[PDB]
Amino acid sequence: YNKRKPRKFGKGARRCIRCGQYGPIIRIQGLMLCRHCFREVAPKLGFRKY
Amino acid sequence: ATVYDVPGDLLVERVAQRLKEIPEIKPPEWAPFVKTGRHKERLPEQEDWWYYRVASILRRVYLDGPVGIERLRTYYGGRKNRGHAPEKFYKAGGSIIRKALQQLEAAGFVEKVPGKGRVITPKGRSFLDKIATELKKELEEIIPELKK
Amino acid sequence: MQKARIKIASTNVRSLDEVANQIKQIAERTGVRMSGPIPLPTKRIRITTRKSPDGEGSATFDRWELRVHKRLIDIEADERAMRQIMRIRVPEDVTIEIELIS
Amino acid sequence: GKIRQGFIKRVARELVNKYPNEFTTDFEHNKKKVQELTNVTSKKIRNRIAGYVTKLVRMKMEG
Amino acid sequence: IQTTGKRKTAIARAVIREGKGRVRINGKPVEIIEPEIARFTILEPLILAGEEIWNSVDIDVKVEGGGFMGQAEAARMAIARALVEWTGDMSLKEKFMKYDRTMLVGDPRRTEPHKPNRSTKGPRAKRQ
Amino acid sequence: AKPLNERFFIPHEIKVMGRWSTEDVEVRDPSLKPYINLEPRLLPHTHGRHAKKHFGKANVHIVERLINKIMRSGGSHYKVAGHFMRREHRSLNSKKVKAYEVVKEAFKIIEQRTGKNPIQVLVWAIENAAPREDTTSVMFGGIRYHVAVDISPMRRLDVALRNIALGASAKCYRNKMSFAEALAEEIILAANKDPKSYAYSKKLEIERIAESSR
Amino acid sequence: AIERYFIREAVREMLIDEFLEKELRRAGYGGLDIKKTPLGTKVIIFAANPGYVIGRGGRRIRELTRILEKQFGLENPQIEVEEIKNPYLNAKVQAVRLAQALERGIHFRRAAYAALRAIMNNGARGVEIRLSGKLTGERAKSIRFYQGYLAKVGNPAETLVSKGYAQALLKLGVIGVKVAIMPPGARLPDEIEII
RNA sequence: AGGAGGUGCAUGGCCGCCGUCAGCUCGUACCGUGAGGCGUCCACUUAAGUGUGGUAACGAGCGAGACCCGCGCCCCCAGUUGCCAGUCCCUCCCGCUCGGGAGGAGGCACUCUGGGGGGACUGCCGGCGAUAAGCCGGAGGAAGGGGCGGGCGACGGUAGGUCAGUAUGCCCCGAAACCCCCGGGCUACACGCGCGCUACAAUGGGCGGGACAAUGGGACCCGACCUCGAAAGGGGAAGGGAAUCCCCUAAACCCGCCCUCAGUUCGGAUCGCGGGCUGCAACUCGCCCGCGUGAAGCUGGAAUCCCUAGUACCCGCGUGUCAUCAUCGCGC
Secondary structure: OOOOOOOOOOHHHOOOOOOOOOOOEEOOOOOOEEHHHHHHHHHHHOOEOO | OOHHHOOHHHHHHHHHHHHOOOOOOOOOOOHHHOOOOOOOOOOOOOOOHHHHHHHHHHHHHHHHOOEOHHHHHHHHOOEEEEOEEEEEEOOOOOHHHHHHHHHHHHOOOEEEEOOOEEEEOHHHHHHHHHHHHHHHHHHHHHOHHHHO | OOEEEEEEEEOOHHHHHHHHHHHHHHHHHHOOOEOOOEEOOOEEEEEEEEOOOOOOOOOOEEEEEEEEEEEEEEEEOOHHHHHOOOOOOOOOOOEEEEEEEO | OOOOOHHHHHHHHHHHHHOHHHOOOOHHHHHHHHHHHOOOOOHHHHHHHHHHHHHHHHHHOOO | OEEEEEEOOEEEEEEEEEOOOOEEEOOEEOOOOOOHHHHHHHHHHHHHHOHHHHHHEEEEEEEEOOOHHHHHHHHHHHHHHHHHHHHOOHHHHHHHHHHOHHHOOOOOOOOOOOOOOOHHHOOOOOOO | OHHHHHHHHHHHHOOOOOOOOOOOOOOOOOOOOOOOEOOOOOOOOOOOOOOOOOOOOOOOEHHHHHHHHHHOOOOOOOOOOOOOOOOOOOOOOOOHHHHHHHHHHHHHHHHHHHOOOHHHHHHHHHHHHOOOOEEEEEEEOOEEEEEEEOOOHHHHHHHHHHHHHHHHHHHHOOOOOOHHHHHHHHHHHHHOOOOOOHHHHHHHHHHOOOOOOO | OOHHHHHHHHHHHHHHHHHHHHHOOOOOEEEEEEEEEOOEEEEEEEEOOHHHHHOOOOHHHHHHHHHHHHHOOOOOEEEEEEEOOOHHHOHHHHHHHHHHHHHOOOOHHHHHHHHHHHHHHOOOOEEEEEEEEOOOOOOOEEEEEEEEOOOOOHHHHHHHOEEEEEEEEOOOOEEEEEEEEEOOOOOOOOOOOOO
16 A cells, blocks of 8 residues: 555656656656756767757 | 649639539538638638639649648648637638538549549549630730730 | 668768778679668757756756768678678667668 | 967968978968878868968068 | 759759740749739849840749748749850840849858747847 | 739839839939939849948838838837837738838829829938938037037938838828828828928928027 | 667666666776677676676676666676776776775875876876865865866867766765866877978 | 755755956066065957067966857769659640640659868958058958857856755654655735736738748657548548658738728627547646627836847747646747
């Protein structure tokens, strides 16, 4: 009875992979990552500024 | 000559008055009680509105070839009010042009290519371009330069 | 009459370039016809995110870009030719997908 | 601003002082010479260097 | 003889040949194009050319991209190139650059990208 | 549609709009002769780099400038007699075909009321609407004071055209009378130094004030 | 959906990196590479000392061989340990080194200058070190030591200089260390030679 | 263990601004007892601590620029992107049989696309500037005076904000301040107030037709296309995991016509009925379809913002959050 309800939709459905936040989770082809997280890891993705 | 050589604004009226003769096309009972589109707020002013619509629909079959229900719905769709929020583009109703398509097909002017829409018969082609040549032979007199 | 379509995806243009050099220098050594390398429109992926971690402050955003280059090479069906393509050393960044069409 | 950058101004002195005979008032002639005589990989700075060595030659014979 | 002309995003491919004098945009006559203001600019260049060359060749141009007015600009642009190529006459080229320099030059203007802080309203449109 | 293609083909011999070739028109005032463009053009819409040059407005055609002034009349600081002149409904901006049509009809209206070239009526209206004096603040030691000032001819053209457009737009506002009629009537009143042309009146006002601030 | 594969492999690539940084912090976790073969996934770990990564008799790596195959779901991973050619050229490794030194309670100025001299003696061209946080009091401080040449902005700074950030724990809280290293080989665009 | 429990004047990074600012510094020498000063000052120029000429200083570093990305012209290569380019060959429709138009073959013309290179360098001429730096003018050229638009934004401060994302010292609880669930709330309301949309209509409202995008995005997906319902939508389903299938049409504009200036033939708020859609469920707390309904407002004082060329205004579309939901944010 202490298990969280599986949520297919709503904000509780998704979850940032790295830091574990429920806030803005960006899903450009499914990253499942927080907005604050993406900044520290984008150059490691190979992303680049232009 | 062809439809491409004449303005569409006059050609649609000519086609409408010509198709008014053939009884294959007829506005159903619900026709005078439905406005011409979801994007439209007010009913059509004239009562000939039905026969222009077919006169429009067949015209696109001469131009866009096999086109189905939804793309035609898109073409007739237009700009509509949304309260305080700004205007938005919406799609025309389905059955209004669907029954028109059935009437045109039953008249033999057009035929169906499944999975692609409906194309125009050589009979329909000859009818439309005969109307167009009539209009162009007319227009060459008031406007000589179209003779070129 | 049978041909092989090969599509090479690479984030690195140069890693693509030497692999294309390998497959093209295969062609004249093998004496088999080769249609020139077709460069597809490079696919750009754009992602924008506000710089501020909290809500305070002005609005400043960072726009990250991924450019993945796609190239096509179409070659004949020569068993000796296609036997030497799986022996090609390919970098980890590059990927190769081959279909055999008629 | 159109002030010529400092290290271009510096580097142009040596090409003059070492091969004064190899350059003329023609921009295109000097362009190839400065292309080879350095290891410049930027065509823009190559054009800049060519322009300033051209100016230096142009003021040479004046005194 | 072929000719190309770009404008905004409108691109026009024109083919000209010995013919009656008919001019067709996208297969439609030059004289019955509904925008009248666009028709005027479409018909501007050949007026200076003279009716002799107007009636000595037939021209067909296909345009795509941009708006109707961009399309008209591209059509006229390609028209001048094609016709001066056919004639190869300097005097008409002088007439064109006297009337308008873009006849054989083109307008390289292009849209600036919109920037944040009310991106919709434009690159240089900000809040209060 | 016969008038449409008619007006399309009649200016085939290089004419402004559809009619009224400009050889007849004459610039009486010596100042604006080297600054008003009267070159022969079919369509007066260059889209050119007139903005991107110091005096790119010399080469813009006069009717093109008139259309441009008509382009931008609604909503700003000015409140003529307490009126937020604003074009909420289908504003002329970004719609040059509408202004083109409106000025076409205004040219016809001017022509048939005057029985002569509307373009020469426009020239006379602008010549008679052009101010001759203004004022400016000049200081020395911080004490401002107004000083009478002469105006460069191009600025006179600019203000005259904008004032004519202002009067037309204000007249049509909120009223049954349509915009082209307002514009043609404003032009007509200005051509003859009638004081009810908003353009001519405001010209008289600015020529005053500076009259006493010499 | 090829783009759904590229970033998938990418984001998998750094999750293991951070996991190892959590794990191999003491051994000088230097860098990681991964290559794919039909046999499986060959992972290449550059470390400041593979001896501790080995642990005892390879047991440590054996544990790492398990969770990698399970937590990240990589098909038949084989682990190959290598030594970094010059850790004094690796900003991350030197940053971890200095953070560890401070974590032993060594005086910050002393460790900073010793590490800076060590790296410069290793043939680097320019070093920057910044230390932030509580260093000598209750209020935080920031201190910089720089030597040699170091571009800081523009494209070359993004590509030629190695960067490394480290967090060091103490009784009083955390201290941040930024390290930037310019290897000798790189050349600035501004550098023009004469023949 | 855990706490979105406190402590941002306990921290780390991270962000805003100062500020894309022209600035900040050091090695040695010199001056002063000394805090310190010189360099880094003075005339001209720079977008600039950019350079030019003079100097008790000579050099160097960081910053600027150089650097990198997109656009604009050309050369080469590249073809399942494009084409009665030309195209014999075949088919069809019109016609005055001349000719006009559409489909297959067809080859690379040309478009498009992505790899390399050139082109624009004060390059040349005239003047200004001391003859220097540099500035102005002129030609030619697609493009000139940093070509244009962007990315990269130091030394330090703001105990600015962020510990309510991550890591995090101190302190509090630790069957509570931990975890799970239900229900409500996070909207509620006389208002002051920042930023947006609409209205205040001739420009309009209504009926048909005509010409026009690209950003992107698409697999519990985009979905053509077929069928039905006026519609919301419902049943099937081609193609497509992507130059190949779909979102897809543009709108703004004009053409032929009706209403003709009024709080109304404007405006739709508010209110009822029925029907449709997502989610287990949408009174609190979603959207849509048709009918009836019609609110204020007819230009708005003080005050005050923004913009300088594809720029401002007008018009629409894609995209994040998302099952629906934007007058939301970013882009075309």
